[PDB]
Amino acid sequence: AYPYTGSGYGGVGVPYANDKVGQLYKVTPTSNIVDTAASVSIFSTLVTLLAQTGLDYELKKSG
Amino acid sequence: VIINEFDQSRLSDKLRKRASIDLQGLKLPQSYAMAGILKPKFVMKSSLSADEKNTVVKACYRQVFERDIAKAY
Amino acid sequence: MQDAITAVINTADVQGKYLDDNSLDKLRGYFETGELRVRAAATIAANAATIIKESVAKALLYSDITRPGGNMYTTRRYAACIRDLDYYLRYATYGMLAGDPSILDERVLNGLKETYNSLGVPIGATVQAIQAMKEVTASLVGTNAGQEMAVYFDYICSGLS
Amino acid sequence: MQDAITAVINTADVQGKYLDDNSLDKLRGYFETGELRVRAAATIAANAATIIKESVAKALLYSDITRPGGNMYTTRRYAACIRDLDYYLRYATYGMLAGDPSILDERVLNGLKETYNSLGVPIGATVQAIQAMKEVTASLVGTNAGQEMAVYFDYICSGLS
Amino acid sequence: MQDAITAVINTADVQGKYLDDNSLDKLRGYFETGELRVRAAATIAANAATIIKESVAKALLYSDITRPGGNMYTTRRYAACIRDLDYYLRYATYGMLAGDPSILDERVLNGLKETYNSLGVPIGATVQAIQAMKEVTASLVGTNAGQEMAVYFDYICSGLS
Amino acid sequence: MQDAITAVINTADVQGKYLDDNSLDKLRGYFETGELRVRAAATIAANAATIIKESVAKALLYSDITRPGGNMYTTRRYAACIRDLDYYLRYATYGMLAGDPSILDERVLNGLKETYNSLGVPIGATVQAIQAMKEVTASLVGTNAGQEMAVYFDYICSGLS
Amino acid sequence: SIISEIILNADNELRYPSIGELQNLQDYFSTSESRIVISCILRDNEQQIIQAASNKIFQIHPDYIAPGGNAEGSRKRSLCLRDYGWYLRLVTYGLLAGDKQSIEKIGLIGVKEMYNSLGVPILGMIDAIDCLKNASINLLDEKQALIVSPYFDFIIQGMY
Amino acid sequence: GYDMDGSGSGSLNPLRIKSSGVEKDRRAFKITYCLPSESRLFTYRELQNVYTTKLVPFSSWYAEQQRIQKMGGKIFKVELAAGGQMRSCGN
Amino acid sequence: MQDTIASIVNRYDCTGKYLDNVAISELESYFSTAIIRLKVIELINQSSSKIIQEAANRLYTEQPELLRPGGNSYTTRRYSACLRDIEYYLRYASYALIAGNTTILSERVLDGLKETYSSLNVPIGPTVRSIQLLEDIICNEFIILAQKQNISTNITFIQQPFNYMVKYLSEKNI
Amino acid sequence: SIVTKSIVNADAEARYLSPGELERIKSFVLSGQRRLRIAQTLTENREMIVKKGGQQLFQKRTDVVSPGGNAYGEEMTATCLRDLDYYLRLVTYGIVAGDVTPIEEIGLVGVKEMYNSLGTPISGVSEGVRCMKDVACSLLSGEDSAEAGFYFDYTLGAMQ
Amino acid sequence: SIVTKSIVNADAEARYLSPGELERIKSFVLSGQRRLRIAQTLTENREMIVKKGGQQLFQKRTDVVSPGGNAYGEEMTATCLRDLDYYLRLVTYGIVAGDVTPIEEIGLVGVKEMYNSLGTPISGVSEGVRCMKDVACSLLSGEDSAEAGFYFDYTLGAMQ
Amino acid sequence: SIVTKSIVNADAEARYLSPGELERIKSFVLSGQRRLRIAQTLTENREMIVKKGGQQLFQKRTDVVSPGGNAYGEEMTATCLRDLDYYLRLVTYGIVAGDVTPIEEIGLVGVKEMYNSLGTPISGVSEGVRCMKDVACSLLSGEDSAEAGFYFDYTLGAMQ
Numbered sequence A: 001a002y003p004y005t006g007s008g009y010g011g012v013g014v015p016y017a018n019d020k021v022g023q024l025y026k027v028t029p030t031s032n033i034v035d036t037a038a039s040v041s042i043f044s045t046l047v048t049l050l051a052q053t054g055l056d057y058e059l060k061k062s063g
Numbered sequence B: 001v002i003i004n005e006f007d008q009s010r011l012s013d014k015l016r017k018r019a020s021i022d023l024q025g026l027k028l029p030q031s032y033a034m035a036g037i038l039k040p041k042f043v044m045k046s047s048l049s050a051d052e053k054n055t056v057v058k059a060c061y062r063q064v065f066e067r068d069i070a071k072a073y
Numbered sequence C, D, E, F: 001m002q003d004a005i006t007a008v009i010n011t012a013d014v015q016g017k018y019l020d021d022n023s024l025d026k027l028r029g030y031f032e033t034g035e036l037r038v039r040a041a042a043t044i045a046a047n048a049a050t051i052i053k054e055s056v057a058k059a060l061l062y063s064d065i066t067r068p069g070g071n072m073y074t075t076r077r078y079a080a081c082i083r084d085l086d087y088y089l090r091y092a093t094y095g096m097l098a099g100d101p102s103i104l105d106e107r108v109l110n111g112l113k114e115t116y117n118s119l120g121v122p123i124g125a126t127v128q129a130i131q132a133m134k135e136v137t138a139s140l141v142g143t144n145a146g147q148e149m150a151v152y153f154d155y156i157c158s159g160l161s
Numbered sequence G: 001s002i003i004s005e006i007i008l009n010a011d012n013e014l015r016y017p018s019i020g021e022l023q024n025l026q027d028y029f030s031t032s033e034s035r036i037v038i039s040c041i042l043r044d045n046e047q048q049i050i051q052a053a054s055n056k057i058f059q060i061h062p063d064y065i066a067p068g069g070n071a072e073g074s075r076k077r078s079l080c081l082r083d084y085g086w087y088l089r090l091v092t093y094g095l096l097a098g099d100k101q102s103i104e105k106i107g108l109i110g111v112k113e114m115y116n117s118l119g120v121p122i123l124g125m126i127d128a129i130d131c132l133k134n135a136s137i138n139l140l141d142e143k144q145a146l147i148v149s150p151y152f153d154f155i156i157q158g159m160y
Numbered sequence H: 001g002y003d004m005d006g007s008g009s010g011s012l013n014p015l016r017i018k019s020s021g022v023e024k025d026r027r028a029f030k031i032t033y034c035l036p037s038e039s040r041l042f043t044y045r046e047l048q049n050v051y052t053t054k055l056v057p058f059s060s061w062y063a064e065q066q067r068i069q070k071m072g073g074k075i076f077k078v079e080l081a082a083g084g085q086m087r088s089c090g091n
Numbered sequence I: 001m002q003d004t005i006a007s008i009v010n011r012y013d014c015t016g017k018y019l020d021n022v023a024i025s026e027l028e029s030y031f032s033t034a035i036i037r038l039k040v041i042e043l044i045n046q047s048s049s050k051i052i053q054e055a056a057n058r059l060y061t062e063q064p065e066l067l068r069p070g071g072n073s074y075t076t077r078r079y080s081a082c083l084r085d086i087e088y089y090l091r092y093a094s095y096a097l098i099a100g101n102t103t104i105l106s107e108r109v110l111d112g113l114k115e116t117y118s119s120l121n122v123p124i125g126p127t128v129r130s131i132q133l134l135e136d137i138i139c140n141e142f143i144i145l146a147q148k149q150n151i152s153t154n155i156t157f158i159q160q161p162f163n164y165m166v167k168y169l170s171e172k173n174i
Numbered sequence J, K, L: 001s002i003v004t005k006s007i008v009n010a011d012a013e014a015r016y017l018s019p020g021e022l023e024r025i026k027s028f029v030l031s032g033q034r035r036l037r038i039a040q041t042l043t044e045n046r047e048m049i050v051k052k053g054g055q056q057l058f059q060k061r062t063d064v065v066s067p068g069g070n071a072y073g074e075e076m077t078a079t080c081l082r083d084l085d086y087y088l089r090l091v092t093y094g095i096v097a098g099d100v101t102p103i104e105e106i107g108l109v110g111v112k113e114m115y116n117s118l119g120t121p122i123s124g125v126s127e128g129v130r131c132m133k134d135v136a137c138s139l140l141s142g143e144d145s146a147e148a149g150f151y152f153d154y155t156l157g158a159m160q
Ligand SMILES: *[C@H](C)[C@H]1/C(=C/c2[nH]c(/C=C3N=C(/C=C4\NC(=O)C(CC)=C4C)C(C)=C\3CCC(=O)O)c(CCC(=O)O)c2C)NC(=O)[C@@H]1C
Pocket: D065, D071, D072, D077, D078, D080, D081, D082, D084, D085, D087, D088, D107, D108, D109, D112, D115, D119, D121, D122, D125, D126, D129, H035, H036, H037, H038, H040, H047, H048, H049, H050
């Protein structure tokens, strides 16, 4: 029911990390806060407000 | 195998180009290199069996330290 | 990373000011709690083995996890499990003794949730093992230092969850 | 990786049971097909260069690819292309001889789709080249062993597509 | 990378054609402007330090940035800042003297927007520093060569923005 | 390496004995001289630049060495020269502050005579430069600490010779 | 180009292109119209160079013509003729760029692996570039043969 | 050993690229690059997986990045994972 | 790796002097012989592997015992190694002629060569012969192509690098 | 900070803090209120240290305030005393930190590259910090100004 | 030692010792007399600690002195108490050193490989050192046996 | 030297000199006589150049020859002009070499560390070499002093 990913002799044989290829720490598919708030049709007024104030800039940071 | 190997080619001599300006480059015939026992190269990948991770890691200690520091001490 | 002192110099520095009376009150707070943090770290250093043993015995063993098909099944997995409990205890002590959990942000909780959700490590069993170490550790170091270690173990549990 | 034997010890181990009659029947199946796997690997080892030459000649030459504009147009690109066909043939032989395509999951298919979609290597032509190696290889090893190699070449083609 | 010559051999190569009169007109254009680009590269090579000093003095000093709180406030960050202005001047000179900004695509603009948006380098100030280098450099090399350097500094500014 | 403390534990250890009153008298001697060693190392750390400048000015300049043909004649050789005087001063400070010249045996004097007789570095001029550093350094730290520094500089000079 | 040589070398050394290098640029820009004249002359004369070249080459080695060789029939001769056209084209590229990046990166890196894959012997390539060189030298001037001559030589050096 | 003392162009260390890393700093960047080599067809070295992902130390990321761009690599996603940002003290 | 120019300039660095009439004369001689040197490099650039196979066939007909079971060049592998080395000698000797200085030969070839061939049981005598079998070939081709473009016939600058490597690798018998 | 240095150390050794290092943290956290007294005195006497240290600097070193000098003019001299104020603030941070890590990372890492990019002689900066060391040692006790003065000595050793 | 560790530390960083580390050396050299008192007391009380700690060891753990254990016999018991004498000596070295480097390099680096090569249960060794810790804490003061007892605790953490 | 640069370059690429490379050698060896003219003139006019350049240096920059400066007095001024003589010699070596390799390796590699070890303002050295540039450009033609003056410009860019 809850198989533990193991390439060889670990257990069931599910490929490692429960994905097609046995690799981990894959590149992130997500984007910055400004980008995800800009991609959606709503939050458009926030993208304008963060554009005006310059808090666009602090949300681009990776903290 | 003889009449297979007489068919094929000269192989390609292995060139060795150095990015640095000072170093000198030297070629080797690929015939000279493939005599002996090939020296295995240990590769680490995210998805591998725990034997293959342990052999690569134990190979790292032998490379950096000149000896195994896990078996001893 | 940063301790409480470095954090004070960060705020006072990033304002451009010097040290005012508030920042000196914060440094006095840290310097009052100094000795307590030291002896707590001494005791945890002494009894780490027993903390991990008692906490694994309470939280994890004789269940589906060490039964076959659970995550703890096989020697390699058991040793990896108790190894991770050792890291949580050690970095929780670092976070206590600095007085600032930034170390837990830098060197532990980074990518750990993606790791455990990648492998299939159960989050809830991990959290309960950490809380078992919180109870046992607070029993060793006492009330005040158990509160301090309690905020850092709770910080890691909040990090995973 | 794992072969069919490792896979059997995986299932019977992960249940916690011993080896029952079914798993011994699976080990008997593999040990019956063993010698056929061996001689097939021997023949493919013998005639690798003729496999690659005839498969490139069937699938890739005299087209837009080797004409200017195509991805195989220069000598660097030609040599890289036939180099990759060498790897597909060698790892397909490993997968055949293990009886389990886990090798192709671990050491081939990993990162290669990202790599070819990064460079601009065409997937379609690659798949057609691998199927040309399947037909040539099946012509060398015969019907049964050509079915075996057929499942592993089809496995890599299913991986890239 | 590629210069104007290599780019002409790329288009004429990728058509399969030889060099016709249009491509020879493009090479004649570059070979007319060659010596001007050489002496411009000589002057900028001579006065790089003074370009960066005058451009940092125009664009960056005595503002919020070098005041505390700004991104240039410490000596570590000042030195990293002027380091980066050095790279922009050097590769802008390579791009000028090649006649083709592909070097700026390969060795500068790659990953740098991700880097600065990761660390917190302000893009605006960077762009204004590059434009200050554009004005100072154009003042050193003169009108024509200042137009050439102007298209490459504007290329970097268009890259980061 | 080893300090005076480690050397005491080495002799007492290699006899198998514990620490008797003689060894405790030696540790009391080191712990009496400790603070003097500290402030001497602090002052040398402050004024290393001026020690090397005044000692090169006394010992090496305006002679055949900096005249053409001499070993200090170019700027690369000048900078390598004063770099080596920096090593002698730094390791002499380490030897002073440990109270045991084993550091000079391990990391400076091993193979240095073979190095300078390989390269063509004059040993005599080097010794005179070190003694100039001895006089200037003794002038900065004073009488007692200048005697201590004196033992280490004389140790290196006895090593080269 | 020569420009690519200098700028990539200056990028590896992390410094600006030096004085000898920029003067060598000014000489290269000075000789500019001559190499254009050479690529025009080599552009006008090709069918003659590939015909005369090819007839010399198949006159030297008739085994490749013969059945059981790689160049029998109509299509395989056409392919060889096509290859001759390509080498002439790369030589013109190496002339106008003034270096070896076009010639090595397009036609000489992994050229052995390709010909040994195609079952084409590479000594025929060597004599092939010999006769391409000879016909091209016949159509060029006297200094001009000295200008274009080492390019074919280095292509033969790629072939060895 | 902080890589910013006594910068080159007249300093005896031959010019090398020098990072803003603090002594023993602990900041790292999660990166995604792609590498096609060039040395392989004349060297005939065994094949390796070019496209990787790793945590590069912040002090040395600068040099790793320049080096990827020098050998024609392409970089996809630079995130700062490990460290805190715009901190005047404490790395 | 200094050429003639940098050798002269380093000499006047050791002096401390400026360039006098003697320096400028020696430089003018170098810049005069350079055109001839370039033509020689074009010759070896044309006919390199022809020179190498000729010096090979001469070498092995003179010393047939290399292909005997006792000998060194006895195998395919050892043969290809030997031809590799002859390619080295021709390459670096070509570098020397354009350079006009034998410092490249010392810094990149000769230093540690006696030790390497002593370590591998490669014989010295065959090696020395191979270098002069290169020298004679390049000499002859330059005499023919010398007399075509008329030329100064003189060939001591061509003999100089090969003579240098022969003098270096040669055990001293007096 | 000393605590930070003590950690990072056993973190890279991947062990708990040793007995020794914990005794060092005890000695540090017991020496705390004396440090806060020192930085209190250097805090509330900053204008005398900057003014008087600037006077002794410009009187010892009449170069930079002479015409055609880096510190020439009222605004340039004010910027000079502004930087002496910076290093005084950083010295107070290094006193309360019990380590020169604040001094090093805020002020010293890459200082020579900055003042060489400004045209400023950095030996004049070191003479200025030495002058503020003499004034700050005139405002404190014996052992007290030994300690604080040794923090100034660290900054002098980094400038030279 | 602490001095050794600091010198090695800034030596690998190729700098002189920072202010922080020099304060650490000051605190060490002023804490000396107390340390020498502790190691004096553990020196002159060694036979009580070895004997009484051996009694509590063998009474808590009747395994190893049973027939069939490792330490069965007169000679074997004598060797067992000999090793407890060794670790007592090394604890005293670690007390005067102010660092567990003597303890680690003389006694701990590769101890498990040795006792696994001898057949000895190393958990019995750790129980023995804990017994000597109880006796040595019975012979000292509060803070005193806190310090020394924590050196014993380091040795127990190395055995386990 | 360009010839040496060409060699080392194809030597690290492990190939024979390319077609492109040879042409650079031709341009260099044909430009030889011109270079030797230039360095002949700056050689035989060196005494005049050192004097006049030093006069313009000390007259433009009265700092260093003032009391308090580096070059105050007879002996010091003589040493100052001695160095201007050095850089004149090195510039002539870089003219005949066709490359700034001699100038760089004799005179520029590690110059800032030497003059920082002497107390010497290196901006005054760069002003001195600029003064010699003006005099040496007064002694030559248009294109001639373009060439030589640009070698002086290299030395000024290394000092700044
Ligand atoms: C040939 C049938 C097709 C083709 C191929 C092609 N490949 C490349 C470049 C690379 N290919 C790889 C492949 C692998 N790496 C692995 O580890 C494995 C599993 C063992 C495989 C299959 C890699 C790493 C590279 C790049 C660097 C390198 O090879 O060392 C190219 C090069 C493209 C370019 O512009 O560089 C080509 C052209 N091309 C076709 O058109 C065919 C369909």
